[PDB]
Write a protein that binds this ligand. Sequence first.
Ligand SMILES: [Mn+2]
Ligand SMILES: [Zn+2]
Length: 207
Amino acid sequence: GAMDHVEFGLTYSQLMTLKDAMLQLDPNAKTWMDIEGRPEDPVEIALYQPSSGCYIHFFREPTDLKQFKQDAKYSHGIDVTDLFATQPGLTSAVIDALPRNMVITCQGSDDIRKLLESQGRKDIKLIDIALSKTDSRKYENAVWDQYKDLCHMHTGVVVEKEEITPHCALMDCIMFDAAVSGGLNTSVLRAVLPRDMVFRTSPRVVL
RNA sequence: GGGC
RNA sequence: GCCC
Ligand SMILES: [Mn+2]
Ligand SMILES: [Zn+2]
């Protein structure tokens, strides 16, 4: 609305906690970013630094629910009911807190660039690895094998017709890095954001 | 050819 | 199916 004037989706307390958590990100380490959903209506966001194993991973409820269902069928297969408990404002807050002039690597930078441009972050530099589907997803199976427990959102059947493994923003980052590095390391990853920041947590009585 |  |  024209009479609605809200600066942040998050409280100062939570913005301060986000600021501190994001000190785990190295401003100069290789950093992957991927999203599921349209750049103007993202539903899953991931950033990944292989050098430390740190990742940022969170979700967002879509506005265009009709487009979402169509995108789910052909790409991400995310159940929309699973996106209810998400934190609003988190996409903007994370992006706003990214280091100035950060270099982010991605596969098909067009959508990532639009999202970042829409958040006023034209200072961020983007490296596009511009691989084929085949080359970019060489380690798809090995990544899912090792890290499936890190995302449970992709339960829908995704079609290409032929059925395919759903696209996860987090698994994508990890497998794209594996492709470029020419191998997948066995290593335990670390979530940068606290769980209660990403999802609504826990009532002992209804009403 | 990419992306969802 | 929609986007570049
Ligand atoms: Mn992508
Ligand atoms: Zn996922």
